Design an enzyme around this catalytic site. Sequence first.
Site, mmCIF file in Angstrom:
data_model
loop_
_atom_site.group_PDB
_atom_site.id
_atom_site.type_symbol
_atom_site.label_atom_id
_atom_site.label_comp_id
_atom_site.label_asym_id
_atom_site.label_seq_id
_atom_site.Cartn_x
_atom_site.Cartn_y
_atom_site.Cartn_z
ATOM 1 N N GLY A 186 -4.958 -1.530 2.231
ATOM 2 C CA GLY A 186 -6.284 -1.752 2.931
ATOM 3 C C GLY A 186 -7.266 -0.956 2.300
ATOM 4 N N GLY A 222 -1.545 7.629 0.936
ATOM 5 C CA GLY A 222 -1.733 7.664 2.327
ATOM 6 C C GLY A 222 -0.496 7.492 3.266
ATOM 7 N N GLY A 225 0.791 -1.368 -0.029
ATOM 8 C CA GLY A 225 -0.212 0.135 0.186
ATOM 9 C C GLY A 225 0.820 1.225 0.030
ATOM 10 C CB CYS A 226 4.424 1.633 -1.246
ATOM 11 S SG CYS A 226 4.299 0.902 -2.886
ATOM 12 C CB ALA A 227 0.530 3.772 -4.484
ATOM 13 C CG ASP A 240 -6.079 -6.127 -7.159
ATOM 14 O OD1 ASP A 240 -6.931 -5.852 -8.028
ATOM 15 O OD2 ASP A 240 -6.529 -6.141 -5.837
ATOM 16 C CG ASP A 295 -0.370 0.450 -3.639
ATOM 17 O OD1 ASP A 295 -0.143 1.243 -2.779
ATOM 18 O OD2 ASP A 295 -1.243 0.116 -3.975
ATOM 19 C CE1 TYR A 350 -10.947 -0.402 7.358
ATOM 20 C CE2 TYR A 350 -11.797 0.208 9.283
ATOM 21 C CZ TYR A 350 -10.745 0.214 8.367
ATOM 22 O OH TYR A 350 -9.509 1.161 8.631
ATOM 23 C CE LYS A 354 -7.858 -2.395 8.381
ATOM 24 N NZ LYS A 354 -6.516 -2.362 8.054
#
Lengths: 236, 236
Positions: free
Chosen positions: B71, B12, B8-10, B41, B32, B155, B159
């Site tokens: 996430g 946020g 998820g580095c791209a 994906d 990502d 969600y 989590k």
Amino acid sequence: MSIIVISGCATGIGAATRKVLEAAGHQIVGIDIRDAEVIADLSTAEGRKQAIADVLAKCSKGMDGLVLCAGLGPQTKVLGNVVSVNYFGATELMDAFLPALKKGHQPAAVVISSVASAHLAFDKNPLALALEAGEEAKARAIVEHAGEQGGNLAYAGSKNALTVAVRKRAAAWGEAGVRLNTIAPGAFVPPMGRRAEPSEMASVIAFLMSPAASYVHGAQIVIDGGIDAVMRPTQF
Amino acid sequence: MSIIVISGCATGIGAATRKVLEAAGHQIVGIDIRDAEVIADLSTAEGRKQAIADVLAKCSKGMDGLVLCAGLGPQTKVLGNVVSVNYFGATELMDAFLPALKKGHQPAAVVISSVASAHLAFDKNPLALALEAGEEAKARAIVEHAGEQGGNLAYAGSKNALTVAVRKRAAAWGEAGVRLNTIAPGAFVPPMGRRAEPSEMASVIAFLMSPAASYVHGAQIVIDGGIDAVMRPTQF
């Protein structure tokens, strides 16, 4: 120019925390029975009141931080002192220092609780009601009239009550613009395979007192090498 | 030299964390859908399997750290993907990468869960058993057939199961000498009453990935400006 008050500064985590914070450029006003700018015994109301006055006299323009490390564990000779120092020694001081903290620069506070705070449920805590009501004599009597154990009751009970007290202050401290968090040191062989050095407690406190923890407030950071995760995987 | 894998580095927190760790001198191998060394994906079994293979091929000598920031939030169109990415997108990767982390220097991993993980009890989590059993289709079907608030279930459910999964791995990871913790985002300047900047999440991750957190293992660090404390004063 950046004062940080530290109780229990003479030994253990408190001493290790003084070291790390001084390395950050903070002026420390310590509170302990010895080797401290403010000599005090937090086991009695009079002792705490005088300690508070002695500290505030040196922080008339405010303080930038507060770290409450004073504490007594089980096996302590007189069990009444465990409850007095562990709970009231923390609550009365943080409550009295908030006004000063409010005037500080990027003000924050850390309270040393214990993983033992999770060994009991607050609503099942024999000391909960007494401690929250500020009934010190009653709380001391309970542990002094405790069955077989007593030490674990005074310790776990005071630490559990302490963590809840800190969390119940999150709203008020947040409005005042001051962060308030706790650390919970461990208390067999941890998953990480070794015992902790006081410095490893102090480094987490240093983090919590810095801008790196700018959005961390009202939290309890467990520092125990993984024990809590193994014992209570589903509870957090 | 010092490789840190970040999912998820791209955008946020993943992006903010990549910036901070890169400044710390680390070589980043990001995962990502775009703007990453490993394009993937994580919503499908084959997708994660390929991502794992592509990462391992770049970390043959090991990796010093792992930060799972991939996430999807509630309100994501296809709810099944929320469960797949949030849970399996994290668990399959951390389990596959443990051998690599074991070979690293002061290895540590951080998994981004959510304060929502505490809004549901594991024993009352309708996704718990399926997720633990690795029954992805069953888990996805549960949330896509939930109807009302299936989004919150997907969600909070993923989590909650994620935080428990990480805690149940504390023993094994500790024995391997690799620290594993989670951060639980909620959503300078006082935190209460404002949203956090991704940088304030990244600064905590940086702390957890450093020697300052040497005795912090299996813990979940809540980063929410105090909201959780106000809502759950007696639970922690």
